C-alpha cells in the first residue's frame, strides 16, 4: 500500500505498508493484465519487478547543503516518518537542515573546566625562567583546549549521532522488510505458476533455477541501498557536528582564551623583575587566539567510521567475480583467480605464459588448450548485470566462425567467437531471442582491450574495443539467459594471447574503461605499432604518425646517407642503451638510434639539425624517448628540448619546433 494511516486502519489485515512507488505503480498497471500462462511472460514479469525494485531502492540524489554535496536518499521520509509534511523529503531536508532529522537538538553543555592561574612564585624569577614557565603554561593550555575539543567530540557522538544511528538501523531494517516482502511476492507467484500452469516441467525447473539467482540479485540491490543510506546519514551527522557543535566549542573557547589572556597580561604587568619592554615582549608572546583551538578536521570526523569490518565487507562483496592472474615461478607457471571468490580454474597444463601489456598472458594453441572457470554467478540469469574485459592479441587468419570464449549451455548463454578479421558477440536466451553483433578489425596481431557491459537495469549492452564505444545496443528484448556455471576459454583454430581476463557483476561505464585502458598502458613502457613492448637490439622500422603507411628509406647524398620518406630501400632501425643489461625501452630514457648497413652506423644531428648517419661509436649523442599517456604507442624522440620532426618538401627529418605537433609523433614496427 501507500497509506500508513490506511494500512493501520485496514481492519482486514490484508495490505502491508511500503514505499516503492515504481513497483507499486507497475503492479497497479498489470492489475488488469492477462494471466501469466507461459515461462516467457513469467520472465518478463520477474525482470520488470526486479528493475522496478532496484529503481525504487538504490536511487539517490545529490543535493548541495550548508556542508557540501550529499547523497540524499529520498525514501527515508516514507520509511521513518521523517518530514512527511512537506511535498518531498529533499525539500524538507534542505529547508530545515540536517539538525531536523533528530528529536533532541539542543543537547550540548559546556564541560566543567578548571584552568590553573599563573603561580605567584614566578614573580621573583628572571626573564628567561619566566618566559620558559610561560611557554610551559602555553603548551599545557593548548593541550587542555585539545582535550576540551575531544570531550565535545565525544559529547556530540553520544548525544547527536546516537539518534542518527537509530535512524540508520531503522532504515536498514525497513529495507530488509521491503526486500522480504518483494521476495514473498516473487515466491508466491512462482509457486502459483508451478501449481496452476501447463508449462513444461523442464521449463519449471529452469524457472526455479533462474528465480534463485534473481532473488540473490535482489539481495545485492538491497545491500546497495543499505550502503547508500548509511553513507548519507554518516555525512549528515558530520555536517551536524560542523554546523551545531563546533560553533559552540569556538564560542566557549573564545571566552576562555579571553579570560586566560587577561590573567596572563595582569600577571606579567604585576611582575617586578621584568623591564617594560620585556613585559610587552612576554605579553605579546603568550597571547591566545583562534589559531590555538582550531582543531576541526573533516578527515578525522569521516574516518571515525572506518573499521576492519568495513574493509572485510567491502572485499567480500567486491564486484570482481573473476580476475585472472598469471606469473612464472622457477619450475612452473601459476595461473588462477585473484578475486577472492570461489571461482575454480581447470586449465590445460600446456598453456604457456608470455608477457603481454602489463602482466603475463596465456598463450593458446587454439586446438587443445582449454581453460574452464567455474562460478555460480557465471550461470547468469534474467536480471544480473555483468561485465567481461580482457586483452586480446590474435595470431590467426581464419575467417571460420571459431569459438573464443563464453558460457553456452544447450545453446543458451553468451559467447564471443573469432570471425573474418574481427569478433562476434552472441547472446542467446532460452526463449530464442538472440543478440548477434560483429566487431571489425580486431584480429591484427595487435593487442586490443575488449570490454562488454550488460546492464539489466537500463537494459544496455556496451562493447568497447581498445577505448572506443564500438557498440551500444538495447537488450530490452532479451529474457533469461541462464547458462552453465562454466566459462570456457578455447579460442578455436586461432593461437592467441589473452591477458587480464576479468568478469565483474556490475555494468561498466565508458569512464571506467578509459581509466583501465590508460592505467594499464601507462606503466612507463614504450610500445611499437603492434602494442607490444619495444626493446633494444631489435630490428624495427620507423614510421611517422602522419605517414604510417609510408616507411623510412635510406639514400646516399652529399657523401653522406640520409633517411627520408617518399611522397628506395627501407631503413632498418634499432635502439641502443648505454648499459648492456637493459632489454626493453622504458619511457624517459636515453637512446642511440642505429641503422644496419654493411657496417653498423649510428645517428647524429648535424648543424642544420638534419639527421645524419655517422660511423663513430662515441660521437653519436643520446636522445630521449617519451610519449603521451593519452596515446597508446605514438612515441616521440627529443634532444636537448628539441624533438625530431618531418621536414618540408624538398622529406627528411629535422630537429625543429616551429611546426605542428603531429610532426614530432613517430612509431615503430
Amino acid at each position: 500500500s501507500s497509506d500508513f494511516l490506511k494500512v493501520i486502519s485496514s481492519k482486514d489485515r490484508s495490505l502491508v505498508y511500503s514505499f516503492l512507488d515504481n513497483t507499486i505503480d507497475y503492479l497497479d498497471s498489470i492489475k488488469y493484465d492477462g494471466p501469466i500462462d507461459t515461462d516467457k511472460k513469467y520472465y518478463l514479469w520477474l525482470k520488470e519487478i526486479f528493475r522496478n525494485y532496484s529503481f525504487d531502492m538504490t536511487e539517490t540524489q545529490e543535493v548541495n547543503t550548508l556542508c557540501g554535496f550529499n547523497k540524499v536518499v529520498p525514501w527515508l521520509g516514507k520509511a521513518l516518518n521523517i518530514l512527511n509534511t512537506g511535498n518531498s523529503f529533499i525539500e524538507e531536508f534542505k529547508t530545515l537542515g540536517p539538525i531536523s532529522l533528530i528529536n533532541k537538538k539542543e543537547n550540548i553543555t559546556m564541560p566543567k573546566i578548571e584552568i590553573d592561574e599563573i603561580p605567584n612564585s614566578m614573580l621573583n624569577l628572571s626573564f628567561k625562567d619566566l618566559s620558559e614557565n610561560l611557554f610551559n603554561i602555553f603548551s599545557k593550555n593548548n593541550s587542555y583546549f585539545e582535550k576540551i575539543y575531544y570531550d565535545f567530540l565525544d559529547q556530540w557522538w553520544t548525544q547527536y549521532y546516537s539518534q542518527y544511528f537509530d535512524l540508520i538501523c531503522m532504515a536498514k531494517r525497513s529495507v530488509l522488510a521491503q526486500e522480504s516482502l518483494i521476495k514473498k511476492i516473487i515466491q508466491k507467484k512462482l509457486s502459483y505458476l508451478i501449481g496452476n500452469s501447463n508449462i513444461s516441467s523442464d521449463n519449471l525447473a529452469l524457472m526455479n533455477l533462474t528465480t534463485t539467482n534473481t532473488l540473490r540479485d535482489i539481495s545485492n540491490e538491497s545491500q546497495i541501498a543499505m550502503n547508500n543510506v548509511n553513507n548519507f546519514l554518516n555525512n549528515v551527522a558530520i555536517c551536524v557536528f560542523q554546523t551545531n557543535i563546533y560553533p559552540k566549542f569556538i564560542s566557549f573557547m573564545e571566552q576562555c582564551i579571553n579570560n586566560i589572556n587577561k590573567n596572563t597580561r595582569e600577571f606579567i604587568q604585576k611582575c617586578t623583575n621584568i623591564t617594560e619592554n620585556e613585559k610587552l615582549q612576554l605579553i605579546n608572546q603568550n597571547i591566545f587566539s583562534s589559531l590555538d583551538f582550531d582543531f576541526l578536521n573533516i578527515e578525522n570526523l569521516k574516518s571515525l567510521f572506518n573499521s576492519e569490518t568495513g574493509l572485510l565487507i567491502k572485499e567480500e562483496t567486491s564486484p570482481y567475480e573473476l580476475v585472472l592472474y598469471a606469473f612464472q615461478e622457477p619450475g612452473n607457471n601459476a595461473i588462477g583467480d585473484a578475486s577472492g571468490k570461489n571461482t575454480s580454474i581447470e586449465y590445460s597444463k600446456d598453456i604457456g605464459l608470455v608477457y603481454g601489456i602489463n602482466s603475463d598472458a596465456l598463450y593458446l594453441n587454439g586446438s587443445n588448450q582449454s581453460i574452464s572457470f567455474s562460478n555460480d554467478f557465471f550461470e547468469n540469469g534474467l536480471t544480473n548485470s555483468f561485465s567481461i574485459y580482457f586483452w586480446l592479441r590474435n595470431l590467426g587468419k581464419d575467417t571460420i566462425k571459431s569459438k573464443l570464449i563464453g558460457s553456452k549451455e544447450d545453446n543458451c548463454g553468451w559467447e564471443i567467437y573469432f570471425q573474418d578479421t574481427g569478433l562476434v558477440f552472441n547472446m542467446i536466451d532460452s526463449n530464442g531471442n538472440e543478440k548477434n553483433i560483429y566487431l571489425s578489425d580486431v584480429s591484427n596481431n595487435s593487442w586490443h582491450y575488449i570490454t562488454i557491459s550488460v546492464d539489466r537495469l537500463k537494459e544496455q549492452l556496451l562493447i568497447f574495443i581498445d577505448d572506443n564505444l564500438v557498440a551500444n545496443e538495447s537488450i530490452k528484448e532479451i529474457l533469461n539467459i541462464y547458462s552453465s556455471n562454466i566459462i570456457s576459454l578455447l579460442s578455436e583454430n586461432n593461437p592467441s594471447y589473452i591477458e587480464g581476463l576479468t568478469i565483474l557483476n556490475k555494468p561498466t561505464t565508458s569512464q571506467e574503461v578509459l581509466s583501465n585502458y590508460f592505467k594499464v598502458l601507462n606503466n612507463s613502457y614504450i610500445r611499437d605499432s603492434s602494442e607490444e613492448r619495444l626493446e633494444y637490439n631489435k630490428t624495427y622500422q620507423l614510421y611517422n604518425y602522419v605517414f604510417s603507411e609510408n616507411p623510412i628509406y635510406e639514400i646516399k647524398q652529399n657523401n653522406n646517407i640520409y633517411l627520408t620518406i617518399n611522397n628506395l630501400q627501407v631503413s632498418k632501425f634499432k635502439l641502443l642503451s648505454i648499459n648492456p643489461n637493459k632489454q626493453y625501452v622504458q619511457k624517459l630514457d636515453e637512446v642511440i638510434i642505429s641503422v644496419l648497413d654493411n657496417m653498423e652506423k649510428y645517428i647524429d644531428i648535424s648543424e642544420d639539425n638534419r639527421l645524419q648517419l655517422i660511423d663513430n661509436k662515441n660521437n653519436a649523442k643520446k636522445m630521449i624517448i617519451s610519449n603521451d599517456i593519452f596515446i597508446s604507442n605514438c612515441l616521440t624522440l627529443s634532444y636537448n628540448g628539441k624533438y625530431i620532426c618531418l621536414s618540408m618538401k624538398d622529406n627528411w627529418m629535422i630537429c625543429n619546433n616551429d611546426m605542428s605537433k603531429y610532426l614530432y609523433l613517430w612509431s615503430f614496427k
Binding site: E59, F138, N286, L311, E315, S339, Q419, N581, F630, K649
Partner: protein
Amino acid sequence: MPFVNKQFNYKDPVNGVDIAYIKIPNAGQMQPVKAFKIHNKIWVIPERDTFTNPEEGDLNPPPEAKQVPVSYYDSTYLSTDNEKDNYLKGVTKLFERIYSTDLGRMLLTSIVRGIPFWGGSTIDTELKVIDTNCINVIQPDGSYRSEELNLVIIGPSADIIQFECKSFGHEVLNLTRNGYGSTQYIRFSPDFTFGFEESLEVDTNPLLGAGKFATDPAVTLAHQLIHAGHRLYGIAINPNRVFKVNTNAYYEMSGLEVSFEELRTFGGHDAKFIDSLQENEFRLYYYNKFKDIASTLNKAKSIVGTTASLQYMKNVFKEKYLLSEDTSGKFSVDKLKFDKLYKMLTEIYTEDNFVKFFKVLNAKTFLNFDKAVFKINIVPKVNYTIYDGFNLRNTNLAANFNGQNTEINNMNFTKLKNFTGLFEFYKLLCVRGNDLCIKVNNWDLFFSPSEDNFTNDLNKGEEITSDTNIEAAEENISLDLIQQYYLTFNFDNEPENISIENLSSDIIGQLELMPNIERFPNGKKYELDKYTMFHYLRAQEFEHGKSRIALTNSVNEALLNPSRVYTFFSSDYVKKVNKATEAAMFLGWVEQLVYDFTDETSEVSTTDKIADITIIIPYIGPALNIGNMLYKDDFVGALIFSGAVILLEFIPEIAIPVLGTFALVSYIANKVLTVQTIDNALSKRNEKWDEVYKYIVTNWLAKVNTQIDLIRKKMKEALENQAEATKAIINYQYNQYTEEEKNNINFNIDDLSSKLNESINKAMININKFLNQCSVSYLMNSMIPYGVKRLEDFDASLKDALLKYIYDNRGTLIGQVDRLKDKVNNTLSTDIPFQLSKYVDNQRLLSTFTEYIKNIINTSILNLRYESNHLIDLSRYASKINIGSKVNFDPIDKNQIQLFNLESSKIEVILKNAIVYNSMYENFSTSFWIRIPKYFNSISLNNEYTIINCMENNSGWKVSLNYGEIIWTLQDTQEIKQRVVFKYSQMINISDYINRWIFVTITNNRLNNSKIYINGRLIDQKPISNLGNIHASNNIMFKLDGCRDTHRYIWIKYFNLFDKELNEKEIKDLYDNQSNSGILKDFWGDYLQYDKPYYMLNLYDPNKYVDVNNVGIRGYMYLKGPRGSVMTTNIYLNSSLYRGTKFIIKKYASGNKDNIVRNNDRVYINVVVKNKEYRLATNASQAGVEKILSALEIPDVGNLSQVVVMKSKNITNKCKMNLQDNNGNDIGFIGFHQFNNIAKLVASNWYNRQIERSSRTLGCSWEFIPVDDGWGERP
C-alpha cells in the same frame, strides 16, 4: 617568405608593374582605377565596387532590405585616400595572416596556380585566352598592357558586409562550372565584421564573457577566397541547387537561402547536409568536365596571342589540373589524382578547417545567425596580430577567447546600427483567446529541410561482378590528413607571368546571370491554441526605464504588462525580488539573490531509469513551455516515459526504402570467379550497412540536431533574460537609495554581472550536456532501428539469394559448398553496430577527458613553473617574475622552490591588472605542494608568519604558517577577516604531514564556505558568505614574513592559481597528476634516487625497523623494535626515524645517468651493515611460499636471484619491491613473515595473488627515509 613582397601605400606612385591604374572588364566604359599587385596574378583595388556590375552603380541602400539577418549601409566609407590606404593595409594583413597557416598557404598556392582556362577560340586546335579573364594595366608612359590574373580583391558593394564573389562568363559557357574558371572579384571589406553568439564552447572554456563575439575577419576572407577558388577550377555547384526548407507551419521560418556551394565551403556539420549520392554525382560530373578539358588539350596544335611555347602551356595546364602525360604526350584524367584534387579543393579547404587552424571562435553552423555589426581596425599591431588575431598573446585577450569579445575588448570593436531593424522580416505568432500576438524575427525561427534534399539509391538493385571493387571508407577530415597533404603539397611551382598580345582598350564583359531568388512572404500572421517557446521567451523580456518591474511566474500577465517579466524560477525567488528592500540589508539581499540564482539555474535531476540519458534539467520545462503542461516534475516524468521526442518541435519524417537486392551474374566452370563474386557480395553488403547508416546520420544532422541547437540557443537567451531582468531590478533598488548610502556601499554592478554570467555559464554547460545526450539518444533509438530492420530484411533476402546461387553452382564448387554455406549464414546472421564516432568526430571520449585535464591545468590564471633555465608563468598571461638572489632550486628537481627567512629570498609575481582579485563575489582557487620542517625551538609557538602574501592595505588573501598549522586568510575592504586552518600535531609516532610534501589546495566560493584540502582530501572549511569586497595585492610575495626563527625555511612547488572553485574530483585529479606516478618517492616526498642511503620502514608495523641477524648464506633479515622516540618537551615527540640498517638503490637496468627511480626499474639493493654494503640476495631453492631474504657478499652472490623491480602505486610514499631472477620469473614481492617469534624478511608470491589491496596485503608496502635536515634528529 612573406606573402606580399613590399609594403604598399595608397599614395605610392604608379609603376606599371605592381602599382598602376587598371581597367576591368565592364559592360560599357569607365575610367581606370588605381590598383596594387600583391602576389602573382593577385590584384587589389582599394575602391568600392561600383563598376563590375552596372546593376549596382548606386551606393544608396536599395528600397527593399536584403533578406540577410545582418546588414549595414553607408556611402562615406572608403571615400578618402586615408581610408583607402587603411583598406589596402588591412587586405594585405589578412592575406599575410591566411598565408601564415599551412592550410592558408596551400589555399593561396592553389589560388595562384588555379589560372582560368583559355577557351575563347572557335578553332578547336588553338588555345585563345578569354578576354574577360584579363586586365588592362596602364604603363606610366601612356601605353597599356594586358595581363592575365586569377583573383582581384575589390571593395564592397552597396552593402559593406555583403562579401561575395563575382566573375565574367564567356559568350555561352559557364566557366565557373565547366572546369575553365574565370577571374574572381571579391567584394571584401576588412574594416567591418559580424557579431554572433557562441555557446558550445562553455564546455571547454567555462569563463566565456557576456555579449556578442566578433568573427575574425581572416576567417571571412578565407571563406570568400576558397569560394573564389572553387570558381577558379570550375567546380562550383550550380546556384540553382538550394537546400529547400519547409515553411507552412508556424514554428517554421519564413524562408532561408543557402547554396550547396555554401554548405560545401563551410564544412564540418554543414558539409554533411549532402548525402553521399549527390556527392558522388558532383564528383563524377566534374570528373567528366576534367576529362573534356583533357581531350581539348590533347587536340591542341598551337597557341594564339602569345609567344609562349606549346610545351610550356601543356605543362602549365597539366600542373593546374594534375593531368597525366604518356610517352606520346597525350593527356588523360587519372581517377585517383582527380579524386585527391577534388578532396583537397572541396572537403579540405573548408571554413571549419580554417577555424581549426586559426584557433579562433567562429560559429560552427550557418544557422548561427550573426546578430550585430562591428566596425574594427586590424592594421595596428596593438589591435590585431598576424599570428593571433584579436586574441593578443600574453595578455588578457589571449585567455578564454576574450579578445573577440565586444563587451570586454571594447576598444577594438565599435557597435553599429543594423538596418535590418527589429521586426522587419518576421512572423506574428498569436495564441487564441484576446488573442495575444508577438513578433518573432525570421531568423529567430526553426529550420526544417525538405525531404527532396535527401535522395538515395538504396532501393535500386545492384549487380555484382567478380572484378567489382569496394570503395574506400569516407573518413572524416582531421588535422592529421591536412598535414599529410601539406607535406606532399608542391609549393615550388609557380605560374609564369608571360606576356600576351594587347587586348581592347575597353574590355567588354558581362557578369554571369545568377538565378533570381523570390523573396519569401513577409508579415505573415499565425494563430495558435497554446503558447510555445517563442511566446514564453518573449514573456521574459522587458524595457529599460524608470518604472519598477516585477518578476512573476504568470506568463499571461507578463505578456499583458511590459512592466512584468515572466520567470521560470520558484515562488521564493519572485517573492524575494518583488518585496521592497530597505537600505540596511541591500547587500545581504543581493547576496541572497545571487545564491538563489546560482542554485536554481544550476539545478540538476539525475536519473538512472533510462539508458543513455543520465541527467535531466527540470527548469527547461517551464522555461520554454517545452513539450506541454506546466509542472517541472511533469516534464521530468514525461521525459523519463517518452524520451527526446518531447524536445523536438516536429517529428522527423524519416523514410528508409526497401533495400535493393543484389543480383549476382552466374559464372560457369570458374571457381575463382565464383568465390570472388560471393566475397564481393558480402563486402558490398557491409558497404550497404555503412551507407544506410551514413544516410540516417545525415538525416538526423539536418532534421534533429538543428532543432536541439536552436533549443540550446533559446535556453541561453532565457538565462540571459533572467539575469538582465534581475540586474535591472537590483539597479532600480540601488538607485532608489540616497547618494550618501550609495557611497557607503561599495556595490559594483560589473562584479555582479560577471558572477551571474559565470553561473549562467555553468547552467549552460549542464544544458549542453543534457541536450547532447537527448539528441544522441533519439538518433540511437528512433532512427537507427528502422535502418537496422531494413538491413536485416536485406540480409535475409541476400542470404536466401546467395544460398540459391551456391546451390545452382554445385558442380563448379565440389566439396567447398559446406564452407561457403556456413560462411554466408554466419556473415549474414550478424549485425554491424552503429558507431557514431565513425561518421561524426564530435563524440570521442578521448577528446572529452583530454579537454577535462586541459581545463584543469589551463584555466589557471597563474601556472608558475620552472622550465629551461628560468622560473616563469606558463599560463595564458605570462605574468612577471622577480627572483631574489637567495632563492634555491633543487638540483635533482629544479621545480622545487626553497624559501628561507631572509629579505632577499623571495619570489615576486607581478600579475596582469585584469586578473588581480578585486571582486565581492568571484570564486577562486589555489594549489601548491609545500614542505615545512619540524619545529625545534619554543619561539615557534605563537609565531605566525605569512609565506604567500597577496594582501594589500589590510585586504587580500594570504597563506600563512604556524607551529603545526597551515592557515589561509582572507580580509575584505571592511577589514573583517576570515581564516581556515589545517592543524597537524607533532606529538605522534609517525606523521603524514611533518616535513612531508603536502598538496595544499584552497577553494573559495564567495557564496559558500572557503575550504582547505590537504593531500587531496578535505580538511577544513569556514563560511565566508558575509565577506564584502576583497581587493588582493597587485603583486604576490613568496617570502617568510614574520618568522622569528633564523633557520626556518619552506619548500614550495607547482603553485597554481585558478579562477574557479575546484570541485572534489578535480582536486583528486590534480593530486594524482602532479604526484608524478611515473617516479618513485621517498618518505618525505622527494624523487627516489640511486646511490643515496635510506632507512627502512614498513607500513604494516611502523614500530619495527629492519636489521640483519647475520651475514652469510644462512643469514637473514628481520624486523625488531621498539622504534624508540625523539622528543623535545612541549614541541615535538615522534618515533626515531633514523634507526636500523640503511638501503642503497644501485643501477642494474638503468639506461641513463639521472639518479631518478621510475616504475618497473630492475635494480640491485644494498644493505649498509656497520658502514659496509652487502647485496640483498636470496635463494629460490628453499621451499615454502615465503622464501627467506638475506644479505650476501657482493662478489659471492653468484647465480642467486638478486633482481629487484621497483613499483610505485597511487598513497603514503610507499615503494613495492618485487624479486625476480635472471630468467624474469616473479619469485615474489618483498615483505615479512613471522617464524617462531622473529618477523623475518621474505619474498612471497602470495602478495601477488592479492589484488584487493588495503587491509592485510599492505604488509608489502615499504618506505625509504633519507637523512633530511627537516627532521634533524641525530643518526
